[PDB]
Amino acid sequence: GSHSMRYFFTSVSRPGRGEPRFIAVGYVDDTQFVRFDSDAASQRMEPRAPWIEQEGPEYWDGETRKVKAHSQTHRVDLGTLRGYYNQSEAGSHTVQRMYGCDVGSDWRFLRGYHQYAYDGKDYIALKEDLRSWTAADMAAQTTKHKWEAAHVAEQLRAYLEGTCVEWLRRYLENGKETLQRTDAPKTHMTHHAVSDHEATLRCWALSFYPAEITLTWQRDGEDQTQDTELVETRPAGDGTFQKWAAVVVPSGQEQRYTCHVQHEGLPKPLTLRWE
């Protein structure tokens, strides 16, 4: 059971008046545990999961100080990027950043990341070896030359392989009751007649965690994708996820169809067949 910790940062410039809108969220696997919203009254990093509330004042003061420093960097970036791309000061732009680390099944460092986007497109990203950079264009190339000279990769590598992993493990233990528990999907099938000769079978997977999952339809033991529909995995709102897959079949032939559900919380894949 590998795990990860990730931080997402979004900054939107507001030329009309004031500073950029800055929003940061932290996640452990698919569980959000912190957030910061420059628009909120506290102006502090805030908890979003019970198990992070255990952390003392020093934790929250440090995280708050650091996240504010992040917003200022993004504020500066928005200006620097406006220049690089020779853009007007009147339009609103967006800088996004994501970084974090994964620990493998051995609970040891597996991989780290640190990527950046401008107006929704890759800008610059730390490569897997955590020593080189991927720059999407010439604006990002100038940034890359600057970060190489300042040895930014070395400083990040230290955090991603050390601090990042250490805290991820700390959080995993503190919130083990949920973070190290898998919630198997609760499944069932519904039947809806769409005509006198056709019917829709919908296979449901509810209240599962983590979000990763696979739903597949088979007809007489073989995968079928035509006449099917699978919606994107969506949050239930209570920390778990939902998904469904449907297939249109000839009324009276429902029995030939089986829905297959694969999920980490299942010792073996589940197979559903209509009544």
């Binding site: 931080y7 650091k66 996240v67 970060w147 300042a150 601090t163 990042c164």
Partner: peptide, 9 residues
């Protein structure tokens, strides 16, 4: 826990 130093673009 967040990273400490943030380098600018």
């Amino acid at each position: 826990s967040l990273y400490n130093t943030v380098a600018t673009l």
